[PDB]
Design a protein around this ligand. Structure first.
Ligand SMILES: Cc1cc2c3c(c1C)C(C)(C)C[C@@H](S(=O)(=O)O)N3c1c([nH]c(=O)[nH]c1=O)N2C[C@H](O)[C@H](O)[C@H](O)COP(=O)(O)O
Ligand SMILES: Cc1cc2c3c(c1C)C(C)(C)C[C@@H](S(=O)(=O)O)N3c1c([nH]c(=O)[nH]c1=O)N2C[C@H](O)[C@H](O)[C@H](O)COP(=O)(O)O
Ligand SMILES: [Mn+2]
Ligand SMILES: [Mn+2]
Ligand code: NA
Ligand code: NA
Lengths: 465, 469
């Protein structure tokens, strides 16, 4: 049973983890280093000497697709499709295995001794409001079901023992709190946050499994074995046994604070807004604890790399429903969800429009996708050279562009004319069939597969690079 | 005075030229290798062991902007801006700078003529599986018309149809084609002399493809790029001059009325174009260097080498756009948009609705961009040449219905089969600039700027951090 430390050791053995011994400030400096590293496809980073703290800081953990795959016990990135086929069936789901004691409760501090300032929480960007916890697995139960939800919600530092809990309103945690409030007026909402759990639990948390299902159960499937957990000290929630740090506490009903501004995955600052305050009553950690952090900003960043790997998970679920779809890609440059390229084997006139509507309606994660480009299967959706080629040789813009007004949009997307409402554009860049055009359509250049394969065979020997 | 070999030596010194010793077929295989190489921004390629031939094959010469620049003796591409300014003034008497003619030249070391002419000995490439025949793609065709002395150079694709016969595919507005057409009117039934040089010095090659007016010899323009007169030699069987350092020269003529079906061939649009008739070039002489090298390329689904060339040569028009629209910081036509069909323009926006004026400017100001179907306008914090910035801008600064402009019934290239009617179609502009008050009622996002002190500090310890190692 591999905890996070075992994963770091595996990475180090493979030249995928660098230990930095120079002094580096968690205030801005770590982010700059991680950003350059991620942008060059470099390793994960363990800062052994954060200025002013004793606890090392781990970041860029999932900065490459490879390391995301490795984190689910797979060799490489195309095994994620198989995990998609699995995620299909969940639309006896294995419980947690509760241990009696756990490394994450080796050192405990509570009440007045709680001081989040001892932790090397990072400040990512110059106009961010305060240090920000970015890799916390927040654990919650609602009043109506037993399911334990895990989500990653950014958490601003506002005191020795107070964090702001920034869950957006459709999240498991947020819905649990909302229901708790209705069902138990004025009663404190217990919550716990785990930092540095095992990679399967972390990845399970971020995968959009249905609200009905504990993210712990999914992590179990990725791992091959039940998720090892421990009961929290001050509530009935369970956290991963191997976690490096655990924060336990509650939300006082009605207590809120102005959150931000903070730089986002879109590359802009979010403006101030109100979210609940999480009061921390306990902090439990391992001996020699490691603090796991990250940053979001202009893409690409670690979340976006995560999000490309998790798109591979969705391809099979889309293909079950639309078997005409050969590939489906959300470029990290499009802020991970705002633009999709879809390639199909077109079977009839107007086919592309059915596929656009399918992307905009079938799965909720794509409901806010503003641009959808549809192409034939002779295009590689992951290469702008092919996609722009297809756009500029197979479209008449007015004929082949679909615009739909007054559709749901992310309320933080400031480019829509009104908060929560905007338009969508689909580009039909498929070959046009009789009926769709009265011209003689061009015959595209296809490569000889025998020549392709032969050159694959001698590629390394040719040694051009 | 640098010939082509001197250039290949310079490139090799700088890690910009790879010699391939493995056997590779000019039928399809070279193209595959060159295509992968170009798509990865790799070096130029010299195939020393082409299957079935002894003459090495050079391609991907200009597969990178850098190598285009190096080909004109520069670090970077912006000397082409100065040419743009020059060509503007005319609509400088020592731009009538002639050729320097040698008597005897390396390109006439070995000579074959009449029945000994056999183009099949040359490793002419076949680029794509349904191409009709091997195709000569980097020939500088040289012609004179009957009325002026000016020698035109153009690159016209040339299909192999016999031991000594090529098809000459000049489109009808080309210098060569106009010369032939005039020759026909002025001398009915007389043979039209023509010559084709392969592997001239880079300035001559680049000069051939610069769009200079029909009134001027492309040799004069190569002279300006080089800093010195172009070295040439008289052909053996006619009065045309070819570059002295050329690796191979084909001399001959066009018999009036002799034509052949040309193609189909894959073109820069990525499609096959259909068969059509063009004149036949009869080859009476082939002259070459000792140890001659054959210079080739391919065109296809972009990007390809011609498209990278075409990007570098668009720098010739940027200053003319900027004289008129000084708000324009950059103006880029991606190769992967068939070189002219998509433009990315970055501006310093000065008022609400500015992007629309710029779109209309692109679609109206010069004939070079009138047929551009898509135009994306962005702010100057975007690098127009990086799809990571441009997509970021599109997806964070647009509402599609508000910010997309469509105009119907506008002029479109007759060969573009995607428009509903030949010659007529629509255009789209994407206004991906930051929206000002009036354009939006929302509080627009403040972009994330880095702390320059932190950036500089990390620059200072970067090597010591040793992240790579
Ligand atoms: C991996 C990750 C994810 C998330 C986040 C972050 C990371 C690293 C951080 C904290 C760095 C950045 C923000 S941000 O991308 O919104 O700017 N963050 C985040 C947020 N979801 C959310 O509601 N608030 C958040 O604050 N998300 C997404 C969220 O955690 C994810 O959608 C979960 O699957 C939601 O789980 P459920 O609530 O559906 O169970
Ligand atoms: C650089 C280059 C250029 C050209 C070409 C090719 C290359 C490599 C090849 C041979 C690869 C392929 C075709 S293609 O781009 O049309 O697909 N070729 C070409 C053709 N111009 C032309 O009339 N026929 C041609 O066959 N062009 C364009 C032409 O040479 C260019 O427009 C010149 O500036 C014309 O000079 P003028 O006749 O105006 O003096
Ligand atoms: Mn959930
Ligand atoms: Mn000319
Ligand atoms: Na979750
Ligand atoms: Na020319």
């Amino acid at each position: 049973y591999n905890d996070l430390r075992d994963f770091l050791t595996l990475l180090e053995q493979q030249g995928e983890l660098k230990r930095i011994t120079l002094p580096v400030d968690p205030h801005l400096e770590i982010t700059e280093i991680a950003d350059r590293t991620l942008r060059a496809g470099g390793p994960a980073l363990l800062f052994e000497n954060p200025k002013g703290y004793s606890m090392p800081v781990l970041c860029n953990l999932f900065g490459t697709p490879k390391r995301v795959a490795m984190g689910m016990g797979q060799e490489d990135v195309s095994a994620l499709r198989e995990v998609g086929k699995l995620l299909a069936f969940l639309k006896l789901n294995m419980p947690t295995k509760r241990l009696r004691g756990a490394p994450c409760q080796q050192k405990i501090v509570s009440g007045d001794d709680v001081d989040l300032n001892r932790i090397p929480i990072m400040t990512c960007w110059p106009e961010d409001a305060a240090p920000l916890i970015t890799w916390g697995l927040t654990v919650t139960r609602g009043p109506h079901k037993e399911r334990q939800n895990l989500g990653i919600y950014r958490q601003q530092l506002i005191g020795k023992n107070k964090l702001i809990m920034r869950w957006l309103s459709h999240r498991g945690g947020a819905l649990d709190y909302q229901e708790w409030c209705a069902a138990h007026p004025g009663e404190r909402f217990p919550v716990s946050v785990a930092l540095g759990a095992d990679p399967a639990t972390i990845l399970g948390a971020v995968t959009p499994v249905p609200d009905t299902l504990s993210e712990y159960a999914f992590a179990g499937l990725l791992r091959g074995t039940k998720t090892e957990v421990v009961k929290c000290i001050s509530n009935d929630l369970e956290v991963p046994a191997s976690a490096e740090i655990v924060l336990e506490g509650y939300i006082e009903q009605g207590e809120t604070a102005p959150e931000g501004p903070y730089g986002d995955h879109t590359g802009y600052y979010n403006e101030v807004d109100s979210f609940p305050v999480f009061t921390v009553t306990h902090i439990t950690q391992r001996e020699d604890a490691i603090y796991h952090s990250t940053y979001t900003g202009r893409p690409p960043d670690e979340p976006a790399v995560l999000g490309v790997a998790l798109n591979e998970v969705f391809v099979p679920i889309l293909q079950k429903q639309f078997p005409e779809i050969v590939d489906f890609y959300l470029p990290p440059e499009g802020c991970s969800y705002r633009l999709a390229v879809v390639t199909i084997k077109k079977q009839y006139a107007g086919h592309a429009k059915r596929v656009m509507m399918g992307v905009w309606s079938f799965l909720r994660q794509f409901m806010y996708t503003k641009f959808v480009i549809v192409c034939d299967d002779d295009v590689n959706a992951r290469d702008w050279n092919d996609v722009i080629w297809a756009i500029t040789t197979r479209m008449d813009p007015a004929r082949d562009t679909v615009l739909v007004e007054n559709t749901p949009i992310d309320y933080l997307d400031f480019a829509s004319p009104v908060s929560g409402l905007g338009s969508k554009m689909g580009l039909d860049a498929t070959n046009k069939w009789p009926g769709e055009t009265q011209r003689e359509w061009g015959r595209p250049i296809k490569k000889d597969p025998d020549v392709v394969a032969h050159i694959d065979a001698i590629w390394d020997e040719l040694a051009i690079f």
